[PDB]
Design an enzyme around this catalytic site. Sequence first.
Site, PDB file in Angstrom:
ATOM      1  N   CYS A1133      -8.180   1.425  -7.534  1.00 38.91           N
ATOM      2  CA  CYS A1133      -8.875   0.917  -6.339  1.00 38.91           C
ATOM      3  C   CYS A1133     -10.356   0.672  -6.610  1.00 38.91           C
ATOM      4  CB  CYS A1133      -8.563   1.766  -5.185  1.00 38.91           C
ATOM      5  SG  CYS A1133      -8.878   0.942  -3.584  1.00 38.91           S
ATOM      6  N   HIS A1258      -3.139   3.276  -4.658  1.00 39.30           N
ATOM      7  CA  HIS A1258      -3.477   4.660  -5.005  1.00 39.30           C
ATOM      8  C   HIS A1258      -2.245   5.516  -5.327  1.00 39.30           C
ATOM      9  CE1 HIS A1258      -7.266   3.980  -2.648  1.00 39.30           C
ATOM     10  NE2 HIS A1258      -7.708   4.853  -3.505  1.00 39.30           N
ATOM     11  N   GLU A1260      -2.258   8.315  -6.889  1.00 37.41           N
ATOM     12  CA  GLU A1260      -2.704   9.668  -6.715  1.00 37.41           C
ATOM     13  C   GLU A1260      -2.618  10.081  -5.267  1.00 37.41           C
ATOM     14  OE1 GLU A1260      -4.707   7.054  -6.700  1.00 37.41           O
ATOM     15  OE2 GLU A1260      -6.586   7.557  -5.679  1.00 37.41           O
TER      16      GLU A1260
END
Length: 1293
Positions: A1133, A1258, A1260
């Site tokens: 990102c 994302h 994560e």
Amino acid sequence: ASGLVPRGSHMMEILRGSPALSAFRINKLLARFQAANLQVHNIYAEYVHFADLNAPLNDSEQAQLTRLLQYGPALSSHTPAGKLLLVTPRPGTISPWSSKATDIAHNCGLQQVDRLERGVAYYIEASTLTAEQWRQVAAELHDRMMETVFSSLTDAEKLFIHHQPAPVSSVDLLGEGRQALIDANLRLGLALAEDEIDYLQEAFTKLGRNPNDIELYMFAQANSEHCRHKIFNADWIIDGKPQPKSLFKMIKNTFETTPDYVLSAYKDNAAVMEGSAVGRYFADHNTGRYDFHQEPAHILMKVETHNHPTAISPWPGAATGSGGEIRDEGATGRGAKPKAGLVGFSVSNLRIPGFEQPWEEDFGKPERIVTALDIMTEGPLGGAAFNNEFGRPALTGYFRTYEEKVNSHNGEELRGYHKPIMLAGGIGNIRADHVQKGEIVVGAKLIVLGGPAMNIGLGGGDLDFASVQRDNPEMERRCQEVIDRCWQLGDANPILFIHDVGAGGLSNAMPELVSDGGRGGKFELRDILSDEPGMSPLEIWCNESQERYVLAVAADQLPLFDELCKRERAPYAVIGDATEEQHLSLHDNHFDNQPIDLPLDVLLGKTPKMTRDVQTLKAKGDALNRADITIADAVKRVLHLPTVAEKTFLVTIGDRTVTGMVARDQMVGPWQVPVADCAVTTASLDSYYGEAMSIGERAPVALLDFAASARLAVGEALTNIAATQIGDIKRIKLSANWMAAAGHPGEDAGLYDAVKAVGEELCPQLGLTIPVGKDSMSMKTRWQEGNEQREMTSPLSLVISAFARVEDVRHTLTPQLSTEDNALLLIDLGKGHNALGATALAQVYRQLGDKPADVRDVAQLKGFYDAMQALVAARKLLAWHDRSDGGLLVTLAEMAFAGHCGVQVDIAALGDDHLAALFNEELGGVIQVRAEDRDAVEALLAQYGLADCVHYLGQALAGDRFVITANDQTVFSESRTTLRVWWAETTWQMQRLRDNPQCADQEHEAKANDTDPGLNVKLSFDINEDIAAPYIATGARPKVAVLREQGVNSHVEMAAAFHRAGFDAIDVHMSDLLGGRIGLGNFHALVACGGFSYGDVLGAGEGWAKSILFNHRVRDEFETFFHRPQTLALGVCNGCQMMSNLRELIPGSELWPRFVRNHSDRFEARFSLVEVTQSPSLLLQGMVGSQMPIAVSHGEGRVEVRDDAHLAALESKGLVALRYVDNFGKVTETYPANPNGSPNGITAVTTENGRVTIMMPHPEAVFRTVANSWHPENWGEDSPWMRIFRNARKQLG
Ligand SMILES: Nc1ncnc2c1ncn2[C@@H]1O[C@H](COP(=O)(O)OP(=O)(O)O)[C@@H](O)[C@H]1O
Ligand SMILES: NC(=O)CC[C@H](N)C(=O)O
Ligand SMILES: [Mg+2]
Ligand SMILES: [Mg+2]
Ligand SMILES: [Mg+2]
Ligand SMILES: [Mg+2]
């Protein structure tokens, strides 16, 4: 080839930028000029930048500044033509853009830049316009509250004028008597009461000297209603009887009754309750390694408002609403960590052009305030801008419209929200040993942490510039990072005391801080950081500039504090010392004098308590006139009420995944329908314990029944939170935020009765504590309309936020109906009262009705809650959705929308009055259970005393039919899709007017296609196979550089994902690299994390990248790293954007695209479907052909190529690694399935060698299954995305 001219002791340079508006925005301006009879042939807009220089730039430096100022989408330039109108910030103000752009120039080695500022040059071709018409054009192109229009570029010199400090002014009480105070009171707008003037007169007469203006202003801000809470501490006499408790004591009654689990109440600007023992995850001060620390993570909570400023300038009003509340959270105890937000709006009727609803009447408004529509357009963007840039997910909220002429307590009058409710709140976590504020040693250093101040918001508000706030969220993120380093030191936390800087600025905050320690203070004015050298001492000390905190540190901890602040790039200043003597001194080294010199007990001394002697008014209800009401028309209208209608415009503008701890956000199920009743977060990245947040509010009820409105706000907070696994009701803690028009006939007695109803009665009886709250007591607007006084007065508006520790976040139910064999059961806590007064139904037919809902039976409310808890824990619920605005009709409709199915329900048991059965807004809701569990569930509910409230309705069924019967008769029957689209029309029209209408239309029309299968998964690998396990089992853990620039915010969860895959995650700030403390030669892997580095000013990721490129040493270090033969790097990102801008250092990256403003022109926080595509990427090994959803949170994620040749080349090289697909599984450019308009759905690319991958989504945020908004039921702990980090580990070997 840029301009450069003298500008005082400095020189201004003029740098032309890029085109500023997309084609749709240009077309909208053209249509507005045409609708205004302004004959405009064309308009073109270009950014223009202004650089105020303190010394010259050499050719290399000038090229660097020019390159810094090249950013944004590569729209087609036009040669200037027609009339120039330049729009800039108002002279005397400094944009946030400027603060951040200047910071980038300095971090790129351009210290000669004193300040950068930006404007928009409009070129208008309209040769037939007159002078007056040109003024109308200029009016259209700027915000009068923040901006100015100039006719020449050189006029921007005006923005950079140097002003000498203004002196302190004394008020001549000794030479004029009391008249001097009277004059000053008017001149400075102090709004002092007569007894306050008496107090000041006597105090200064005793001191034998004239007060300075600054001392008077300080006193006046400290004694405002906003700051002093006089009404909430007043004595009362009601209908001739003195009452025994103040409002505040009635609220405290709930804590006296129910202290359980409360760690802090009424002694900080947040409350604290017990949390859970979990692994708190952060980087060690000495090693820089991220580690889990098993310990209690206690839970803080706060909610406040920013109503007045939002009526004047809604974007900064909303933004700084969020900002101020976040500061309150971080300044809890001796430091704490915000973790998730909530948001609330109440406005007047929207009256959307072309979409006017039949209940809406234009009643006018003050000229000086904005419309409801403007508040709902700019204000959510402002609040979201702060939550996004600061980096906290925003997970629950409300939005109510109300504006009608009603026969209420004071007879027929206009009731509404011309002055809006603009509400911001949230939860955070805190360490046990930091909950209690510390003592302040004599000689402690007194510090301001945060932004250099300007003359903003002085006194809280010929235009009212003082009500125009200003937000710089990335500044606050830098300060939070320092706060975090402090609390992360545990017993070595150097913060002794910390507090927000809010109303009254330092004039309130610093005296508050020393007084709360039993100390005095001595301060030096010229040590405070300033961006406005012209300010007077009054302005310095009293302004309400944003992103500041006050704290006390021992002198011996200054060196540590300074290290912490410089590593985060958080500005701070020591501005004073704590004293034994309880005196306040402010000295001025420039003027060699003493603007303040006061005993604290003089400064903080109170006039007498208020007494409010008031009388009850009570409206007589009028039965609903049903002449024009049919059930079918009522459904259509109710679904068109903004209060009821789909909320997507308010949801997807805000990030909902940062932290990796979001378990339940607004959007539910495969069709991502915003109907979740509460928010749920995990307590840590390694636990299923968590936290929940819900809201209840019912202000229209208070136009009939003050107490009932307050009981229903509590009740609805409980029914919204009830299908989450909490256990004991005493775990639930409330904020009570009171909005009223104090003094308006009947409202004062109403307020007292309502505070009594919840504080003395309902909350103690249920075992609910109210350990925090706030009040806003001037909720009315007055203006002259034609020849007549007009007034718009809000109902008494209590908003309850409920907060709870959660036992197992996995067990939360949503409104997503199953179509397995099932039963739908209504729990009607209305006990068949079926009240219609003050309902959405009444409102949409311009009525108030007779009698509203209310808490009917306290024991049954508690019983419902405990029954729900038993059902949740036993796993007996398939779904839940509570009844609120729009009644059972809307509960059932929303469940059918979320389950993308039909219902067949019968209402014959609910009374003969079908309209009332369907549309009452009594407490309760609908549970769905497995058909085989029906009898057992009905028996369980019966145990809790509910049998007579429980009604079997029918079942959810596959298909598109929404059918309500009563025995043999069809009461109402419609296509579920038709209803779902009608319910979506409000968000459709809001999106259409605010964003790219093409995108708004695509999103809306997709909802009409019932064949949409929803998000769905195809997996090319076994998501449960830990391919990294054999490596982890050796105990050899390779380092990963978890790289963060100022403003990055997804680093902690990125570290934890790598940690789970076997890495030692190291915190590497760009300051670490610049200072020599880390070298990338010691790493085999690096990840550039997400966020808003430099608030994305100069283009997302641009400043981060160019700060690397323009420092030859750090540039070389990155280049070296990427040119090694086995190093791996990932950009996510903001880090994707950064690395795309750093591609000259990255081998095999020559075909990479740029990432620019999304086609929608809006931030997109979505749970989007992607497919893994064949590419070299070593991080995606084994996953090619997989399709699964992923978190998306970005405004500048659109892949942009130079031309088709570049796209074709990229594609033919085979470097695309992820693509958006629609739910049918096809690669798409249609919105929001592709959220940003990227060609060919591209959203990840890799290098030729596969060793570097960059992606906009994302992974994560969603590596943990529990943090996926929707997921297949059969997944375990790991989602598909955990494979990326495991692949990195295995590749390293
Ligand atoms: N101002 C807002 N900001 C963000 N989310 C909002 C806002 N208003 C409503 N929501 C979300 O939209 C959904 C529908 O809201 P609403 O219908 O008001 O909820 P309820 O009727 O359950 O109290 C919920 O998930 C809610 O949290
Ligand atoms: N979460 C992120 O990394 C967001 C990146 C950037 N601030 C954008 O909005 O495009
Ligand atoms: Mg609702
Ligand atoms: Mg609800
Ligand atoms: Mg609600
Ligand atoms: Mg299908």
